[PDB]
Amino acid sequence: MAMKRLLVTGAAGQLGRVMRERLAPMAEILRLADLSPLDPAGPNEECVQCDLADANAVNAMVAGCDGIVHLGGISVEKPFEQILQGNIIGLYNLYEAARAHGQPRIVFASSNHTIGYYPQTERLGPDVPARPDGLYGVSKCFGENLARMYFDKFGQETALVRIGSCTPEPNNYRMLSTWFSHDDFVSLIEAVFRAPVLGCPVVWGASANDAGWWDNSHLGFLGWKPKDNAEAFRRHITETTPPPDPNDALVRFQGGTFVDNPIFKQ
Amino acid sequence: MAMKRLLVTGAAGQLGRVMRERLAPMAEILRLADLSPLDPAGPNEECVQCDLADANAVNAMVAGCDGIVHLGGISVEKPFEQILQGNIIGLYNLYEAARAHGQPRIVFASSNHTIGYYPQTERLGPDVPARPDGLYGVSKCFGENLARMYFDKFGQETALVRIGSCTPEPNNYRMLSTWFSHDDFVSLIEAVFRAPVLGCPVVWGASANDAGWWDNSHLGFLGWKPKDNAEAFRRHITETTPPPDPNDALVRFQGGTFVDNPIFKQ
Amino acid sequence: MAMKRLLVTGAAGQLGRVMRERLAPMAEILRLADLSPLDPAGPNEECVQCDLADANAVNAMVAGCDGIVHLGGISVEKPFEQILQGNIIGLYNLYEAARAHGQPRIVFASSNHTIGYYPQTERLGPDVPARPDGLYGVSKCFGENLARMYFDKFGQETALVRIGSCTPEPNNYRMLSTWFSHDDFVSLIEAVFRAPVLGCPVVWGASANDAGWWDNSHLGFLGWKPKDNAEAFRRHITETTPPPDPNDALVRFQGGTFVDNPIFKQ
Amino acid sequence: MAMKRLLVTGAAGQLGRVMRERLAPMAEILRLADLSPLDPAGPNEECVQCDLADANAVNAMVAGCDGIVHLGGISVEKPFEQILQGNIIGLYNLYEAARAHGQPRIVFASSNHTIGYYPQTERLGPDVPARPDGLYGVSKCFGENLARMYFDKFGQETALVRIGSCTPEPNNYRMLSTWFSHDDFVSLIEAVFRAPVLGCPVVWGASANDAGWWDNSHLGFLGWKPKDNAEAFRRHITETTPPPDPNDALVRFQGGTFVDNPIFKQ
Amino acid sequence: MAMKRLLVTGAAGQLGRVMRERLAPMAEILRLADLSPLDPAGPNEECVQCDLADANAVNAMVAGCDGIVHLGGISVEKPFEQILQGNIIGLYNLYEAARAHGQPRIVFASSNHTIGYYPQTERLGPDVPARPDGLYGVSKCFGENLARMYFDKFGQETALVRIGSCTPEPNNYRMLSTWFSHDDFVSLIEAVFRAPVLGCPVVWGASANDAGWWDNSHLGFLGWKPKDNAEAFRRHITETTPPPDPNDALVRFQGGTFVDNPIFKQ
Amino acid sequence: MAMKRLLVTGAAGQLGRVMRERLAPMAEILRLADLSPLDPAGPNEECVQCDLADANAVNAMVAGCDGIVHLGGISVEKPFEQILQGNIIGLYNLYEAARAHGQPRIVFASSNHTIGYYPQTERLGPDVPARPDGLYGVSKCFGENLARMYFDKFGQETALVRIGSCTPEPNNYRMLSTWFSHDDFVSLIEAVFRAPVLGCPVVWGASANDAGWWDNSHLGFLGWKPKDNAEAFRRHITETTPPPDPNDALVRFQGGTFVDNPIFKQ
């Protein structure tokens, strides 16, 4: 096994539930954490329910962990205060906790929404300027900037994974480009943790899709090559869903419908 | 006069006190704001003392203003709690207040500290990835990202001015590169407000220094050309200050001594 | 199908005759057009005899069509008078007719000859400055520039396909790089018409050749990946043709022997 | 002098009338030509009435000339028929005539309208893809592409001068960026004819304006540096014209109001 | 067979002995050369034992050869005197001998050590500035620069192959990135000699490794696509060698342990 | 004064003679060295005559020096053995001597001839690939590569100055671009030695010429801005010298007539 104990935050969410199962082989003990109720710990599991904005709780959550896959916090556009707590204060707390406990390597769930306002016709490398499509996107930029600072100042290593659409299967036109299969995310995580040297790289979270918009070539040193391809689903999507309207944000902006979100108020 | 009423936040600080005088000609009324006490309003002035973290107060501060020079908030590395209030919550409040009040154009005091970990030998264009040198730098990145989102989503225009060292004169080796004269900041502000179309550009806040590190050429459309030059002060600095050690952050990193800051705690 | 009526111009030529057969499945009605006589319309076909220089005839040719594959005009280096009629006046007439009849999406047969003077050793992206190798190349540049203008001005969408060598199989050394199989051109056409949003992209018209010179990576959003490979024919070429002289334009310039053409006169 | 005989076409137009006077010192004999009547030849002058669409007349116009400043043809957006004659057929005739008479070096009046659809906020180098703003712009692209072909094929040298606004003085907000003074155009012409080697370079035709949009740095080898600056006129513009609306094409697109032109009809 | 006689220098070394066998099919006669003793010539072979520093001997070695695979000289970090003889003087002698004997095309064994000080995280294209990791690396830079000069001055063509680790299989973590299989080196050599036009290209000498650091895309015109992949060996390497320390040169610098070499003295 | 003792090699040559006088103010003692006879040491001078290929002599030459301006060796195209001794072996000896004596900062006289085969129309940044125009140019590349290796391996700092034409005044067409005034070289040297951090930068050795071919912008951190401008001499050059033939290497290649040099034999 890769390590003694691996922490997975956001473990009660759909993706966290997948990781709770798929990542078990990577560690002797998997510690699952979330604010929302977790299914009780089974064999080789520990479960912690805590508020990322509670610094003391996050310290205890991280203590004893050799790596972290951080999926926790707010995962969609919400009012500012929710995002502030889960994704901004929460991120500061996470990095301070790691700094106090041996700087376990972090896989950070960033998001395509950091660059949501780019047109879908534009191919992006990892250094493109952020164009976040809402407060959620801005908060993920915050996590990226904070992680980079901790890397430069303390040596803390983080993979900044800008997740596209990590779902079981592509099911709309945009997902033909953004789909990130479970298998490919799992292999990415394995490659991140196995690397002797990681740094603080931006990683585009997508499978090897023919219609992909993003260039991961500079990540070559990691030896991670995604194997799934959303294009296999194009025919299926055409046969089972209505054609998109060319005016829909779904087929105009990389962030899809998030660009149409207002600023939500509580 | 450029407008009826111009808001200057952070008006009680050193730079704010200068702008309170220098920007008077740009508007019929100058409204000054700060968390801390302000000298009483003279003719053609209004003064308000408020905390940027308080949304109602920020709404009142912005209402009726045709432009904003945003200098307020935390201006150096501090514990996260203080930065959160002044530069994160405070920024969200400022942008919401602007959105509710006619989207007055904003000059935002960002900072060189957003890129503080770059070596001094590296010349930077506006699109370089951020390398913030502490929590203060990360918080200015947050302001930039938030402003960009409000631009793409609502059309709010902001000049993101990455201020170097805006002081009366250069007084150390680093300032031969980073000096931003009062005159040149004033003329930049004039060029920002007069532009029919601004967008949300990154602006490097420095005078025309021979030893400058930053490239503003893509801002040509604004027609702003700084006129002062720190190089004139090299001899004086050499003959009146101790030669820097080559290992000193002051001559190694663009953020200077900020890279040496710890994470300060409350 | 993909549409009610598809127009294919230049349908009497070699490639047009291929497309008359291969594109039939894409529309309920295939309208074939050419300056030259066509084999009579079969079921599900309409045949039109049209001079592209005749604006009224062109208007009638386009009316009722939901899409256009524009192969017609002059296809090799010829005197200016002929190129003017078929590729310059003809293109203006085609774009005006489209503008008057619902702006049917256009696949434009541009040509490698727009960049014919580049050395074969240089890899080209879609934004390279044109280096046309004669009047024919210049006229294809005209088509591209005119199409771009109609896109920016009216939203007319066009795929600018810079065709390599679209033949049944590679038959000389240059085609190991330039070959564009029938199958791959057909799938490109299918991809162009299926896209919710196209724009006015330059597309390099070549199969997936090991020795290809051109980079279509920025077209990723379209989801088109050619499948054939000229490399499979390398041995066959060595066993059927004399070896190229290193001084031959055939192996020195991307436009091959077109660079050796003088200005032909009527 | 610089040569025995210099041809200036379009000599009846406003700019041509200026050049008739300003370029006299460059040649022993100045030959002036236009479709329209010219004021009679004075000493050291020859005057020619010539339709650029007439190949024989064009041949005679060019014969005996050691250099050409090509200002003639259609100078604004007009119907296709007129642009075809003056700027397409006319250009072919001009290049053929030069080819037959010693390849006299050519200064070609191209136009900013070849790139008219770019936003004014974007700084442009000479290699940017064309985005012409109407048929006039498209026709100037044709001139550039044709000139490049004659250069690669025959060695004919041409300066492709993308003229901004060549007027006595800036008179609106856009000209603070696009102004090209008479003096600076004259010195450019002098520099073009003096160069031992020219090639077929794109030259941005603007004075040294603080608010300029265009980058001529790669033309350094020519040793031409404009000296006038539209910025000197900013106050005068504010005191003689209404302030621009931010929605006006005049301040949104590099081609200004040309983007608002429809396709004009005869 | 590609040619009548192919010269392989450095034929007594490990790689040379492999090529002596693998390149036999490329020529009627294989001439093997080395400073050190060679197994006796078989049918279809010639053998010469000579010092590259001796011009007369190098002239005799080259005369009558249609191509050269230059593996000879010093192959690891050594004192300057040895490098000078084999890789500097020896290279000058080789190029002069070629120039005197019909300029037979050369495959030059350059080395990754020309760029050894780059971090393993940085992806390199062929044009990156050299960062040699010792005197051996500097000497291979000398070969590259000399070859380029002979190309520009005389038309001598050379493939500058920056060899990674050309061994039977990968056997440490670095070789997951640098491995260059025998098969892939052989096919590269085949592609180099068959090309009508080669020029003087930099070629990155590696198989198609998932963890590759180098970009050969601009070499597309040659039609060479490596087929082997070091990634297949990762598990074996992990389970049979000690995990690298993150501070080890082996996982920090592209040149691996060579960066740790001192300047060796005689 | 900048330092106790400054070494200037090549001190008997024309440029060294200028530096012997101009650099005196930079050090208490100037040590002059050359292979050729030096005018005897006057006050505050030491003179050493030695062979750069004699390692022991170079050690003694460098001992006790706090900085080196290295102009010595072969300065034009010569037979290989002369260049080998003065510029290759000589450079190794110089760097070993520096390494053994406190790594005094070095100003290295590299040359435009490292890039001599580039066309004069092409603008070059400091990272362009070398295109040396003879053995002399190759030897200067060797010095650059060796210096970079010593920088990376040992921290030795060197300014790699690619000298254009460092003469009293421009006197031909090429010098309008390549001229490097004495004043500007002297100020460059002062800036190099005063810098707390230098690194191993490529520096283009030319004054602020309107017709300059090279981009020094990335050197901004040094605070060196050349003040002279060869353009001031254009009129004078036109009036006092014959026009260049457009076919002359003097006006075609950046290396001028060096491209026409054969390989010289002793």
Swiss-Prot record, chains A, B, C, D, E, F:
Enumerate the catalysed reactions. beta-D-galacturonate + NAD(+) = D-galactaro-1,5-lactone + NADH + H(+); beta-D-glucuronate + NAD(+) = D-glucaro-1,5-lactone + NADH + H(+)
Enzyme Commission code: 1.1.1.203
Comment field (misc) = D-galactaro-1,4-lactone was previously believed to be the product of the reaction of D-galacturonate oxidation.
Please identify the protein, giving its name as recorded.
Uronate dehydrogenase
Q: Where does NAD(+) bind?
A: Q14, L15, D34, L35, S36, D51, L52, L71, G72, G73, I74, S75, K140, C166
Q: Which GO terms describe its molecular function?
A: nucleotide binding; uronate dehydrogenase activity
Known pathway: Carbohydrate acid metabolism; D-galacturonate degradation via prokaryotic oxidative pathway
- Keyword Oxidoreductase present in the record's keywords: the answer is yes
- Assembly behavior: Homohexamer.
What would changing Y136A do, according to UniProt?
0.1% of wild-type activity
Query: What organism is the protein native to?
Result: Agrobacterium fabrum (strain C58 / ATCC 33970)
Query: What are the positions of the active site?
Result: Y136
What is recorded on activity versus pH?
Answer: Optimum pH is 8.
Q: Give the record's family classification.
A: Belongs to the NAD(P)-dependent epimerase/dehydratase family.
Protein residues bound to substrate:
S75, S111, N112, H113, S165, R174
Q: Recount the entry's temperature dependence annotation.
A: Activity increases with increasing temperatures between 4 and 42 degrees Celsius. Activity remains near 80% of the maximum after exposure at 37 degrees Celsius for 30 minutes.
Q: What does this protein do?
A: Catalyzes the oxidation of D-galacturonate and D-glucuronate to galactarate and D-glucarate, respectively. In fact, in water solution the substrate D-galacturonate is predominantly in pyranosic form whose beta anomer is converted by the enzyme to D-galactaro-1,5-lactone; in solution, this reaction product rearranges to the more stable D-galactaro-1,4-lactone. Makes part of the oxidative degradation pathway of D-galacturonate, which allows A.tumefaciens to utilize D-galacturonate as a sole carbon source. Cannot use NADP(+) instead of NAD(+) as cosubstrate.
Origin: domain of life: Bacteria
Q: What induces it?
A: By D-galacturonate.
Alphabetical keyword list: NAD, Nucleotide-binding, Oxidoreductase
